[PDB]
């Protein structure tokens, strides 16, 4: 309940100007440091054919979902690979919620 599907358009602007330095989803761009983020949702975690995971994400065999994403922002570390992310929380929690909905669009 902490996360509510707001508007993907609003988050798209936020993602477009604050998330292309890595995932670069661009609907079809190079994985770069982070995964395209266009297939994290689907079967278990870690399903990028090109980008590779530390394998830790695969061992957990967890499916990434909007609920799981809430735990990732609120608590992330031992649960998933020691992967380090340049993002360290967002001052605007409302804007962060919009980003979550936008990622769902990346999967489909
Ligand atoms: C490059 C330094 C990164 C930037 C900046 C962003 N992310 Fe990232 N992200 C990065 C890596 C190294 C990984 C892979 C870790 C793994 O094993 O999957 C990720 C992963 C995510 C995930 C899943 C959480 C996880 O499994 O660790 C999400 C949903 C995610 N990243 C979201 C996200 C958003 C909101 C960012 C821009 C707004 C963003 N990432 C930037 C590396 C980097």
**65 torsion bin: left (phi>0), alpha (psi -120 to 50), beta (else):** beta
Annotation-wise, does 19 bind a ligand? yes
Domain ranges of the chain: 1-108
| Experimental approach | NMR
| 92: CB partners within 8 A, 6+ apart | none
31 assigned to a ligand binding site: no
How far apart CA 26 and CA 38 sit, in angstroms, is 9
Tell me which architecture the domain covering 1-108 has in CATH.
Orthogonal Bundle (1.10)
* 1 Cα: distance to centroid of ligand 1 (angstroms): 22
Query: What number of other Cβ atoms are within 10 A of residue 100's Cβ?
Result: 19
Does the beta carbon of 106 lie inside 6 Å of ligand 1? no
């Amino acid at each position: 309940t902490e996360f509510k599907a707001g508007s993907a358009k609003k988050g798209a602007t936020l993602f477009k100007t604050r998330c292309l330095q890595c995932h670069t989803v661009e609907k079809g761009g190079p994985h770069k440091v982070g995964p395209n983020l266009h297939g994290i949702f689907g079967r278990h975690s870690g399903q990028a054919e090109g980008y590779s995971y530390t394998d830790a994400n695969i061992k957990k065999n967890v499916l990434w979902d909007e609920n799981n994403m809430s735990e990732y922002l609120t608590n992330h570390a031992k649960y998933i690979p020691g992967t380090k992310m340049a993002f360290g929380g967002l001052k605007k929690e409302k804007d962060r919620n919009d980003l979550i909905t936008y990622l769902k669009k990346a999967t489909e």
